mmCIF file of C-alpha atoms in Angstrom:
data_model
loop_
_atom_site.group_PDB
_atom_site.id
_atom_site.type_symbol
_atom_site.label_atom_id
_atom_site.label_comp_id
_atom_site.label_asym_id
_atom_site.label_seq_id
_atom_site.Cartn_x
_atom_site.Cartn_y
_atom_site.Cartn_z
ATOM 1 C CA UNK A 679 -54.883 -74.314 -81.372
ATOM 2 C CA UNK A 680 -56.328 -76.595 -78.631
ATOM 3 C CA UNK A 681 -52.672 -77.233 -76.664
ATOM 4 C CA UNK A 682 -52.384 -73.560 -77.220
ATOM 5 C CA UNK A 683 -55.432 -72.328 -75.062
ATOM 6 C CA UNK A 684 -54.526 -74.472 -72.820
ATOM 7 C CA UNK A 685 -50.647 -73.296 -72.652
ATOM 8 C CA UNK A 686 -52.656 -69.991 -72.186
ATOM 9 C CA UNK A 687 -54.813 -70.602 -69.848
ATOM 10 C CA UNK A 688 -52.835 -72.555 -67.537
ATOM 11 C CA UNK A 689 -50.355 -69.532 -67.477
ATOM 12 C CA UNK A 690 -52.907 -67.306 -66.766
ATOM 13 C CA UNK A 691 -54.342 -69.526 -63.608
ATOM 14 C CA UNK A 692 -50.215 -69.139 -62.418
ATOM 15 C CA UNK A 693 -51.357 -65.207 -63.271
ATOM 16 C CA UNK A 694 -53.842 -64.759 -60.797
ATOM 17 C CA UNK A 695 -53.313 -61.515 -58.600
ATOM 18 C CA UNK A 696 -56.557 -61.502 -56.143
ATOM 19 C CA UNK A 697 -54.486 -64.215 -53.716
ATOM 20 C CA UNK A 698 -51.728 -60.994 -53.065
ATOM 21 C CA UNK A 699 -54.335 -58.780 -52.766
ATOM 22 C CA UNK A 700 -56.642 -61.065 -50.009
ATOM 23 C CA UNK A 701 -52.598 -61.372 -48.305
ATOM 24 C CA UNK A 702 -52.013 -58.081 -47.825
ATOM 25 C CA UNK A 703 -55.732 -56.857 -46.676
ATOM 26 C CA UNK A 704 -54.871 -59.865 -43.768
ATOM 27 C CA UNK A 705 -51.771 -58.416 -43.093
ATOM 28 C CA UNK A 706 -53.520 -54.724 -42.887
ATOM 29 C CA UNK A 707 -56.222 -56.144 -40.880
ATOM 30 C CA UNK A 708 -53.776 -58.272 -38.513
ATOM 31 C CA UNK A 709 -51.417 -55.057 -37.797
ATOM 32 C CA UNK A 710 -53.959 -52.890 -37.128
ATOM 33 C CA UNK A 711 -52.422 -50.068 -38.117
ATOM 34 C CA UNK A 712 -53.789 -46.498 -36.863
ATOM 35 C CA UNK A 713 -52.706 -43.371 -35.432
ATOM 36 C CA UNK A 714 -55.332 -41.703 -33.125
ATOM 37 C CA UNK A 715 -53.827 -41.263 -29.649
ATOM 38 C CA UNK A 716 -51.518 -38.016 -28.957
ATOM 39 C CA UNK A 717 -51.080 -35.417 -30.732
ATOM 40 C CA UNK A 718 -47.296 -35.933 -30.946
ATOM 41 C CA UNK A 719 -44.977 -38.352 -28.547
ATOM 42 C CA UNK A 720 -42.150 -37.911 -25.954
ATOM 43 C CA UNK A 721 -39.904 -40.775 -25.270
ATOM 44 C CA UNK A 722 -37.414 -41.611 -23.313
ATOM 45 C CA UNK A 723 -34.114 -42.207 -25.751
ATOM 46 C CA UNK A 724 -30.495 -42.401 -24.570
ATOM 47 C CA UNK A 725 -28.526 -41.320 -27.491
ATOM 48 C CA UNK A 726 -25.269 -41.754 -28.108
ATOM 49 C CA UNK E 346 -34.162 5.849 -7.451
ATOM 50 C CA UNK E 347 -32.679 5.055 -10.828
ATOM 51 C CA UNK E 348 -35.037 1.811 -11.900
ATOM 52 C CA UNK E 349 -32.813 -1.301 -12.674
ATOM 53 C CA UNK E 350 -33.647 -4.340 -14.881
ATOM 54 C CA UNK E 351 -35.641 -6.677 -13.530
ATOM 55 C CA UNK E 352 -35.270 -10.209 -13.479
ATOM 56 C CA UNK E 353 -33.854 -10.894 -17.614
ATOM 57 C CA UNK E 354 -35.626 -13.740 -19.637
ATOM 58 C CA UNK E 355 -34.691 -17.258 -18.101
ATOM 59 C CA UNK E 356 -33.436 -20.400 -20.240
ATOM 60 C CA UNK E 357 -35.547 -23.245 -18.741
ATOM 61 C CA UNK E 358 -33.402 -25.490 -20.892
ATOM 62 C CA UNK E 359 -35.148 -27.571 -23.031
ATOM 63 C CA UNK E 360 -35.098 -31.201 -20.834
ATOM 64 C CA UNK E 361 -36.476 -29.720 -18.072
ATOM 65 C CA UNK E 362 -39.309 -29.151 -19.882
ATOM 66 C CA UNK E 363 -39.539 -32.141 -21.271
ATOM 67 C CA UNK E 364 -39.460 -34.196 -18.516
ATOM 68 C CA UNK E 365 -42.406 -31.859 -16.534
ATOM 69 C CA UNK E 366 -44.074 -32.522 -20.135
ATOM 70 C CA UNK E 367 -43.533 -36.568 -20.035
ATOM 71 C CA UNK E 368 -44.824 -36.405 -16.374
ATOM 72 C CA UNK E 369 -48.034 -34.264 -17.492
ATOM 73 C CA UNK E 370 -48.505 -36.750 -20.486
ATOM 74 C CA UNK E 371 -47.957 -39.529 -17.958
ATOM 75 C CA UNK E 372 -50.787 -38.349 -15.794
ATOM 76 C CA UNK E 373 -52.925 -36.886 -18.083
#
């Protein structure tokens, strides 16, 4: 019972999911995504 | 005196505008 908890409980410490989550709020944060500016853009493309 | 069409609808093709567009966005 005892070196099953443990089996258990040591898989579920290599299932934690908060580290992703803290990952991809840095990510969000560090891209700084947003979209205020223009109403729509003209660019300069030279297509083929 | 027999009135005659005036001057018809003009194209103004469409990168014409867009570059007096760009320029205005440019500026603005």
């Amino acid at each position: 019972g005892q070196k099953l908890k443990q089996d258990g409980d040591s898989f579920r410490m290599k299932l934690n999911t908060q580290e992703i989550f803290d990952d991809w709020a840095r990510k969000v944060q560090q891209r700084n995504l947003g979209v205020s500016g223009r109403i729509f853009t003209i660019e300069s493309t030279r297509v083929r | 005196r027999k009135l005659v069409h005036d001057k018809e609808l003009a194209a103004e093709d469409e990168q014409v505008f867009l570059m007096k567009q760009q320029s205005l966005l440019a500026k603005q």
